[PDB]
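User: Hello! My lab partner asked me to get a predicted holo structure for this protein. The small molecule is 6-phosphogluconic acid, SMILES included with the sequence. Please write out the structure tokens.
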Amino acid sequence: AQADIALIGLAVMGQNLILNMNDHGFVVCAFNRTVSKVDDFLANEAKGTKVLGAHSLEEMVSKLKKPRRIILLVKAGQAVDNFIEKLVPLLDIGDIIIDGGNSEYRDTMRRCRDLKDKGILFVGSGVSGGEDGARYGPSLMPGGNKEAWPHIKAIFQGIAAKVGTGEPCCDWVGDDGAGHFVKMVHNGIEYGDMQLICEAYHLMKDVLGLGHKEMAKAFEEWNKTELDSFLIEITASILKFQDADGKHLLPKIRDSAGQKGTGKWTAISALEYGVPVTLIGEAVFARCLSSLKDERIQASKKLKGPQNIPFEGDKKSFLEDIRKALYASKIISYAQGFMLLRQAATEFGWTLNYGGIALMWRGGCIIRSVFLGKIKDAFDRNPGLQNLLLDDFFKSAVENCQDSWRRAISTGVQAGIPMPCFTTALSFYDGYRHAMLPANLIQAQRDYFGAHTYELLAKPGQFIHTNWTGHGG
Amino acid sequence: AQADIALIGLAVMGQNLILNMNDHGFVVCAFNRTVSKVDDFLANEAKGTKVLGAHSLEEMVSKLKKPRRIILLVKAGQAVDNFIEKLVPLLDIGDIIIDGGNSEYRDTMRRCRDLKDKGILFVGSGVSGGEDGARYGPSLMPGGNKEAWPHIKAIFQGIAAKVGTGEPCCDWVGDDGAGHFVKMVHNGIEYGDMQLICEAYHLMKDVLGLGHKEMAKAFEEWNKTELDSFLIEITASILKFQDADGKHLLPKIRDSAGQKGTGKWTAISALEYGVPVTLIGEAVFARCLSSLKDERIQASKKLKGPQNIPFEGDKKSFLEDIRKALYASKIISYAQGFMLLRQAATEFGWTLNYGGIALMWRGGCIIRSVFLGKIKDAFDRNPGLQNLLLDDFFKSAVENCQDSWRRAISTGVQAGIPMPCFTTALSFYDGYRHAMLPANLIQAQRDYFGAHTYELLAKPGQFIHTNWTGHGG
Ligand SMILES: O=C(O)[C@H](O)[C@@H](O)[C@H](O)[C@H](O)COP(=O)(O)O
Ligand SMILES: O=C(O)[C@H](O)[C@@H](O)[C@H](O)[C@H](O)COP(=O)(O)O
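Assistant: Hello! Below are the structure tokens for the protein in complex with 6-phosphogluconic acid.
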């Protein structure tokens, strides 16, 4: 007993989190599957620090203060289970295993129940921020068995990012897989914001004819308005970036976007639980589309676009329209993501604090922006808020942006610039707005061909089947 | 041994299929879980027919000619397994169980492998057409263990719907769960076409100001053009339909659309296998949206739409634009659905005959239209066709529709009419068209914040990571 916590998994994420913990006065015992890396770390990044090294699992467990707290930061799937299996004969009742990898939420609840009745307290935490986020202040989203929380709270909230009011970007999310489900939705929303930015960029490049310097200048301005965020900031950096030959690097890199599952899982969860999370849907499919790079080369040779009509209009005004279209569409994505959280809370009986979740996304994480602060405000003044768009700030923001947004979609449509996320946000906005929607025709159709029955608009509850086929003869 | 086949499950679907088989000279032995329904059927719908009744499973198996063929048309899930479990001690090696319920494809391959090494030949067939489709000619999509097929071929292709060239709308789809996967995609595409029609309807009602009589008149005209289909036909019927009080029934029924999973499974499969099947995606979410009926009433009170600008333009011309927008968007949905089939064939090693599948959707099924015939042509002249849009017919059709389609989206956008499927089809069309897409910005972003690496456009294969953070200092 010397170390406050142990971390198994010495990739750069692990190492940075150990160093961050050590910088806050926590003695960490490091371990890795390939044990050589432990000495390597101790000689190099960890030289002259309070961290201990371990060369066996049994040794690492004896270095720990009781309750033994141990973090796992290994590749999600089987490895987590393999490590869990090995640690349980070695642990006392009341000891805490913490999985920080991007595990999917259903494995986390399985593991949590199983370990709970073996007396071992489990928590799956999402970590967001990447390498130097992890190093100097990550966003941490813990969930699992709450008996664990008071024991890890000091470490977790200490290494976590801080919001200018002194609050940590880390607090207890909920039971079982809540932290990991929230982490997944975080990534979903990240995909959406990235796709939105790409569409704004495409309108500037191809409608407006902007070179990457003016285009980066436009992004820098936007990062000083309501769009102030990490992602807007670094996009301006990326556009300005010149490679070794003097020319801009971005138009040289291949347009086939990768994915590591977390974004599609959000989309699949929304489909499974019947939540219209359309923009993340479109973002995920927009990446799949770009993967089909060879087909698109061949399609560009064959398929024809619109008549090339030059843009005649004040470019500065159009640049303003793209800014507001982007912000309006961002508002719908976030409303949809927060609808998904509301539904998972209902499905799995989690009591979630949405303003808590907003505060946890305010810093540390990739999606950080002033915008999350406005969402915490929305939930602070009404905790039971049903949808983000029903809050006056968002109501007024979308209402203000409406013109520009419709004008940017119609101009993009005219010029043939693909806007999967900008268009689906307006479709959802106009869909959500309408008290009466043409889905009654779908219900009439289903009853004509598969006798599925329908409700009358006055007294839902009764279900009718009409013999549509012939009303005489 | 007297009966050629047995059918367990006497709902109206089952009864109609038994009667259809009997009308084609096949002696059927009927059975049901609640055995009373068997006598009821034999006294009523089946009086004076060649069908036999059974009052036990053991009796039903002895009535059968070898190889014992038996169809199950029970509620999908556990019931299918329960019945499978009971039948196997009673069956000889080489006997055929056929599941005709809407089972999901992964259960079908499980059951097929398991039964295969117990010597029992399994096939999961999708049935499409509904009650009187089943009665006089359904669309049947069988897949499983091919040793079964020659034994059921005569029955299946005999009761099946016939295309004017004499061909049955039924042929072997492939191994394991191919028939059930195809059935699921069929339903996905059905959802899409229903949503597309709803959007056309919404533009007529709210932009153009058409009453349901002129609106039904417009649909009837469309059913005589390229849009000739079952769904366009019955929508015209539904719009004309007047209730007992003289007034039109459709505006009275509640706009909350139901779902029985088959449409969302298509969408989830596309997400899992990375196929941009966006329109079915949007159709499924557009139903989820309509379910949120109470929220939408409350949202309509709060959220504001566009400035009400009256439509000044030739309504007849705009009506033509909606027709072509619908047909163009239909083409993209079908291209996307056929991309999903192409990918599942690659994932599970099925050799699928896409023109075969088109011929099976040409009649019997809900989505039947002249249009499927054009798709069989596309695949007949080039079996290895990579995407439907690369075929000259579709190339020219979309190229012709382009103007009207862009004009209908921009006018819908102006007036605030939600078009989730019309917009996503144009987004996909313009996305697929472009050889260079802004997904390289997404790859640059992922490398800046999570060091995911990127490829250079010249020599894919090499993966670079740039220190974006500072190129000096
Ligand atoms: O996003 C974060 O904050 C996390 O550090 C982590 O989630 C990482 O970025 C993954 O790689 C997912 O992103 P992709 O699915 O695009 O790879
Ligand atoms: O569509 C058909 O041809 C089949 O007879 C069957 O699939 C039925 O219609 C289901 O109910 C699915 O439709 P929903 O998911 O909308 O209910």
